[PDB]
Amino acid sequence: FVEPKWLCKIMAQILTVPKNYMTQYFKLLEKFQIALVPSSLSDHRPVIELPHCENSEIIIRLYEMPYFPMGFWSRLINRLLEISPYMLALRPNRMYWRQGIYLNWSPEAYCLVGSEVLDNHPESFLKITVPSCRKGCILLGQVVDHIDSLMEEWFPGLLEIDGETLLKKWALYSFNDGEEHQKILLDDLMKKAEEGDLLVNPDQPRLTIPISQIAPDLILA
Amino acid sequence: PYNRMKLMIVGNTGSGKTTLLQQLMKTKSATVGIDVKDWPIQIRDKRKRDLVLNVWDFAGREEFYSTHPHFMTQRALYLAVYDLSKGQAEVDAMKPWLFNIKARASSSPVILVGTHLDVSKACMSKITKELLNKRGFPAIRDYHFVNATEESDALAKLRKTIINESLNFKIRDQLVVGQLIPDCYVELEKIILSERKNVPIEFPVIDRKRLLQLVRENQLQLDENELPHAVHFLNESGVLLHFQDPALQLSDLYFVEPKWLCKIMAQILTVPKNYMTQYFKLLEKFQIALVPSSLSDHRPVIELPHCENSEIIIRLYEMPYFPMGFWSRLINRLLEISPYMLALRPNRMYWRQGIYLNWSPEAYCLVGSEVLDNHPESFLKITVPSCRKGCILLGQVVDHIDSLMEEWFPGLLEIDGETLLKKWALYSFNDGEEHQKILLDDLMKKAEEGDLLVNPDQPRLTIPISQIAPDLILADLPRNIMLNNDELEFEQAPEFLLGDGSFGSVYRAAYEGEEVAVKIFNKHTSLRLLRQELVVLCHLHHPSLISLLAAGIRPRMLVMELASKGSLDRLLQQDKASLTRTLQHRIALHVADGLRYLHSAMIIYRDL
Ligand SMILES: Nc1nc2c(ncn2[C@@H]2O[C@H](COP(=O)(O)OP(=O)(O)O)[C@@H](O)[C@H]2O)c(=O)[nH]1
C-alpha cells in the first residue's frame, strides 16, 4: 500500500454506511477489526439468568483498569471466537454485544466474559464467570491466557511497573460457606505468593478454601 | 333494572382524552394509570332512564400498555380519540388500539373522535372511510370531529351519540343497559358506595370480615354462599375490584375505589408494611414483576449452534400487530415451565420480545419476534432443534401460546376468513443444503394427516410430517407411541364391541394379538385433549394405574390394557359372592397404593 491515507479512508468508509481483490478486501477488513461488525453491537447487556447461583458453584475473576483501551473489546471478542472450547467438535451458543461474549455449551460448561460496573468505583472491570466443574476450569484457563496475551501484545503500557500497575487482576473467593455472600476479593499476585501452601485461611483458621476452587490457573488444575 | 355500563376512553398519548372528558361531563397533567370516574346521565326523554356510565380514561403512554388488557371487557362502550392536528397519520397511528379493542372486546362499539379541530386537515375522514372501516377492526359506529376545552354543537352531538349508542347495545339482542338483577345486588352496591366514604384515604381496601360485618349490620339478605356471585357481578360493573383466585392471598381483601388500585400499581412504572408480600403477588398478577417492560427492545446477536435446514424446526405465528401485553404474559408463562426433561435450570436471555431458553447445543428453544421484508404484519418465529428433546420443547411452547390466545385474546381466533392469526410451518424440500424454506399453512398440513409425508410436484422428494410439525403427529411426547396400524384389528361402528355401556366411547379391540380397550377420542375438537391425556399418561408407570399401550391419529384413539373382569361396580352389583375378605383387602390395598403414587407425583384424582 503506497499513499496510506487512501487505504485508511477507504477502510473507514463502511463504518459510516476492483472485483479481483474482494477476498483480500475482506481479509484486511478483518485485520482492521471491521468484520458481523464488532462495532454497533447495541451496547446494552441483555438480561441473563445463569443456571448457577451459589458462591460455591461459580468462579469469578475481575480485571481492573481505569478505562478499556480503544479497540480492546473488538480484538478480545475476535480472539475468543470459538477458539476456547471446553473439549479438545461442538459449536456453542453465543450471544455477543459490544462488551461481552457468553459462550454457552451446557448448564455446566458455559463462560461469560463481559464488562461489569461496580458502585463507588470509577474504574472499569472485566468480570469473568465460569462454573466450578472441570470444563469450567479449562475454560477459565484459556480465557485468562488469551486476555493476558492480548494485553502483552497490544497494550504494553497497561503492564509496565513503575506501583498500581494500571491493571490489577482480582480473584473473588467467599469464605462465607457459599450460602452467605460478598465474596472477599484478593489480588492475584498475593495468592501467587500464597502458593507455598494449597489453601487460603482467614483470621479464624477453622475455615479454609483450596486455591484450586479460587484460581485454578495458578495451581495446575 | 341495572342502569350501569362502562365507557372506555382509549387513545394515543397527547391526544385529548381527559380534556374531552372534562367537557363531556361539564366538569369545568399526564394521566397515570387509567383514572376511573363515573358520570350519571339524566336522560330527559319520556324514557327518563337515569344511567350511570363509569369512564376509564386510559393513559396513552406506552409503558402502561402491559396492564391495560386487564381492564378491557365486552360489556363496555369504547371511544377512540386521535388528534386531527397531525392528520392522515394520527389515524394510522391508532390502528394498534383498534386492533386491540378487536382482540379483547370483539363485539363492543367504537366511537371515533377527532380532537384538535381548532388547529387545522379534516379530510382524515378519507382514510377513516376507506381503510379503517371493516378490514379486521372493531365495528366503528360513529365518528366526530370535535373540539375540546369548550362546549358547542359538536360536543353536544358527541355526548348525545354516546348516550344513544350506549342504550342500544344489544349483545345478541340483550340490551345491556336495562337488564334485570336481583335487588340484593343493587343494595350491596349502595352499601359499598357508602363504604367508599368511611374508609382511610391512604388505604381504601376493605377486609372480607369487614364486608361480612357490613352486610350483616344492615338488612341485606344475601347468604354467605351467594356473596361470590354478587361481588363478582359488581366487579364486572366496575364498582369494586376483587380477585377470588386462591393462588393469590388477596381474596380476603376487596378493593373498593378501584382508581386508587390502578394508579398505585402503575406508580412504579414511572420510577402498609403488612401487605408487602400481597403487594408483590398482585404486582406479578398485573405483570409488573424483573420488570417485563423496559427490557432494552434490542435483539442481542445470537449465533445458534445449528444452521442447516435439516437440523432445526421453525414455526411462525402471523398477526397484524402483537396485542398490548402479549409478550409480557408470554414470557411469564414460558418462565422455565417448559423443560426438555420431566431438574436442570436452563440458561435464559430475555429481552422485550424473546426468551431463548438454552440447555445444551441440542436442547435449546428460542421464541422471539422476527420481522420480514415486504410484510407489515408481525411474526413470532420459534426455533428448536430437530432432535427428540427439541420436539418436546416445540410441543410445550405451541400449547402455551395457543392457550394464551384462547384465554386473553379471543378475537384473534374468531372465524368470519383470514382469521387474523395464521400459524405457518416452515419446511424445506431443498435437501437441507439449499434454502428458502417453503411455508405451508398449518391447517392445510393438518388436513394432510391422511398420509405421513408431504410431497412436491416432483414426487421423488418427500419429507415426513414429524420433522415439520411434530405437534400434529404424536412425536412431541417421549417414547414414540404410534400404533403400527397394520397390527390393529379394531371395528368402531358396531356397538357389538363397546367396552361396556356408559364407559364413554371405549370399545374393545385386539392389538398385536391381545385384546385391548380402545377409546375413540375423535371428535370436532382438536388434538388438545388427546395430547393432554397422552402427556399425563406417558409418565406414570405404576402397577396400580392403567398402562398405555399405543395411540393413533387415524382416527384419534387411545390403546390401553384390557381389564378382563370389568369394573368393580358390576361385581358389587352382579356377583357379590365372588368377593371374599382376602379379595376385598387386596382391592383396597391396590387402590390405596395407586392414590399414594399419584399424590407422590402431586396429582389430584378428582373423583373416585
Ligand atoms: N386547542 C385544543 N387543545 C387540546 C384539545 N384537546 C386536547 N388539547 C390539549 O391537549 C392536552 C390534553 O392532554 P391529555 O389528553 O389529557 O393527555 P393524556 O391524559 O395522556 O391523554 C391539553 O394540554 C390540552 O390543552 C382541543 O380540542 N383543542
DSSP result, B326-373: HHHHHHHHTSS-S-S---PPPEEEEBTTB--EESSTTSEEEEB----T
Q: Is B504 annotated as a binding residue?
A: yes
At a CB cut-off of 8 Å and minimum separation 6, what does B91 contact?
B82, B124, B127, B128, B132
Nearest CA in chain B to A48: B349
Q: Are B544 and B597 in contact (CB under 8 A)?
A: yes
Burial class (CB in 10 A: 0-12, 13-18, 19+), A91: middle
Of A36, A104, A111, which to mutate for an interface test with B (greatest number of B Cβ within 10 Å)? A104
Experimental technique: cryo-EM
Range list of H helices, B225-305:
227-236, 258-265, 276-285
CA atoms of B406 and B403, how far apart (whole Å) = 5
Query: B57 forms bridges with which residues in the sheet?
Result: B9
C-alpha cell at B251: 381474596
Q: B458 at the A interface (CB within 8 A)? A: no
3-state secondary structure of B441: strand
3-state secondary structure of B142: strand
Q: Is A41 in contact with B301 (Cβ distance < 8 A)?
A: yes
Q: Which three-class secondary structure string do you get for B470-494?
A: CCCCCCCCCCCCECCCCCECCCCCC
At a CB cut-off of 8 Å and minimum separation 6, what does B389 contact?
B340, B341, B359, B362, B363
CA atoms of B20 and B34, how far apart (whole Å) = 15
- Nearest C-alpha neighbor of B6 from the set B231, B239, B187: B239
Q: Is B12 annotated as a binding residue?
A: yes
- Nearest C-alpha neighbor of B41 from the set B55, B60, B25, B58: B25
Taking the alpha carbons at both ends of chain B, their separation in whole angstroms is: 44
- The answer, yes or no, to whether any atom of ligand 1 lies below 6 A from the CB of B30, is yes
Q: A179 at the B interface (CB within 8 A)? A: no
Q: Is B560 annotated as a binding residue?
A: yes
Nearest CA in chain A to B304: A93
Per CB-CB distance under 8 Å, the chain A contacts of B360 are 105-107
C-alpha cell at B261: 388500585
Looking at the partner chain, which of A42, A91, A107 has a beta carbon nearest the beta carbon of B347?
A: A107
Tell me phi and psi for residue B441, to 5 degrees.
-55, 140
CA atoms of A68 and A64, how far apart (whole Å) = 9
C-alpha distance from residue B371 to each of A203, B320, B322 (Å): 59, 12, 12
Q: A90 at the B interface (CB within 8 A)? A: yes
What's this structure's resolution in Å? Answer: 3.4
Nearest CA in chain B to A96: B301
